[PDB]
């Protein structure tokens, strides 16, 4: 017997889902990025999708049990993080994980300066195959909303450099010319809103660390964008904010949660708060309604979707 469904949303006078696209570069980062966000419009009923670029072969890990698996070691690393990102994807109500040009294909290229005896790394692509795969993708999903980091990969890493400019190009080839042509509605780069970290991270209190960490300065944090260069938040409800926890503790080598799960710490120990807002810039398409912030509330708006009945 199938279950009973209703469609859930309308796009003018025919019954349409939306589908949202977040393109990472290694296991965690969507967590890390847009976990509130992707939990956010899951529960919601819209369909979201997360590609993930590699397998974050060059990791660090965090214990000693898989201690061994790194690079320099067994590296088997990248094979491991795969059960972390699934069980991280379904905390957020996503069904799988996505990897760009299949699993395995496109190796971590490590945050540089290790040994790199490799002939597959995602840098090192060659941009007719790994546009050619995310194009691919975008043409079966036909995303109405695609996200990924801004053109200075948020941190600096090679590999978000990377995918920032193969997320950009297979957007815009995507439409031009799984088969048939997909113009992306609204592209936007995921971005750390600086105002929204201070006041997060100034409201941790004791028990929401632990004695090692310690909470990030100015220094530690030049790449966090102004309130007026934001374009767009998505602030998610504490059930959002909730799975965001737990998709990041699913990530055990590479993420320690905090005993409140208000804060998390990575190998650097360096202490974040595991905040609901997520912010962004719009980089392609045109934007909805802007609140007195100047800042859209939702990824979809202005694309016509509207509950089913309204
Ligand atoms: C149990 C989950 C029920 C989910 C019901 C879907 C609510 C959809 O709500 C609609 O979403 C659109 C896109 O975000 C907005 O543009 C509309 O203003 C909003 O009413
Ligand atoms: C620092 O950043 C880390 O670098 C590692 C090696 O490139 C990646 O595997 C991790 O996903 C990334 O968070």
Not at 81 to 94: D, F, H, M, Q, W
Not at 290 to 295: A, I, K, L, V
Request: with cysteine; charged share 20%; proline share 5%.
């Amino acid at each position: 017997d199938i279950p009973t469904t209703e469609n859930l949303y309308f796009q003018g006078a025919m019954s349409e889902t939306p589908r949202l696209l977040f393109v990472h570069a290694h296991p965690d980062d969507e967590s890390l990025s847009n976990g509130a966000t992707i939990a956010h419009y899951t529960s919601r009923g819209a369909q979201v999708h997360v590609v993930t670029c590699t397998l974050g072969e060059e990791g660090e890990v965090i214990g000693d049990r898989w201690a061994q698996l790194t690079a320099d070691h067994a590296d088997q690393l990248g094979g491991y993080r795969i059960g972390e990102l699934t069980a991280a994807l379904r905390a957020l109500g996503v069904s799988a994980p996505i990897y760009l040009g299949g699993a395995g294909r496109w190796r971590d290229s490590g945050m540089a300066g290790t040994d790199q005896r490799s002939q597959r790394r995602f840098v090192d692509a060659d941009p007719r195959q790994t546009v050619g795969a995310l194009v691919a993708i975008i043409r079966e999903l036909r995303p109405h909303v695609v996200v990924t980091y801004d053109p200075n990969g948020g941190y600096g890493h090679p590999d978000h450099v990377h995918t920032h400019t193969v997320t950009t190009a297979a957007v815009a080839a995507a439409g031009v010319g799984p088969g048939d042509p997909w113009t992306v509605p609204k592209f936007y780069w995921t971005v750390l809103g600086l105002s929204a970290l201070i006041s997060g991270a100034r409201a941790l209190v004791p028990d929401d660390l632990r004695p090692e960490w310690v909470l990030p300065r100015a220094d530690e944090i030049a790449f966090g964008y102004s309130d007026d260069g934001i374009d767009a938040v998505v602030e998610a409800d504490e059930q959002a904010r909730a799975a965001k926890v737990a998709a990041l503790a699913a990530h055990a080598t590479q993420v320690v949660v905090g005993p409140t799960g208000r804060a998390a710490a990575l190998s650097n120990n360096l202490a974040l708060p595991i905040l609901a807002d997520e912010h962004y810039v719009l980089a392609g398409g045109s934007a909805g309604a802007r609140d007195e912030r100047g800042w859209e509330t939702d990824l979809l708006a202005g694309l016509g979707f509207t509950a089913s009945g309204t």
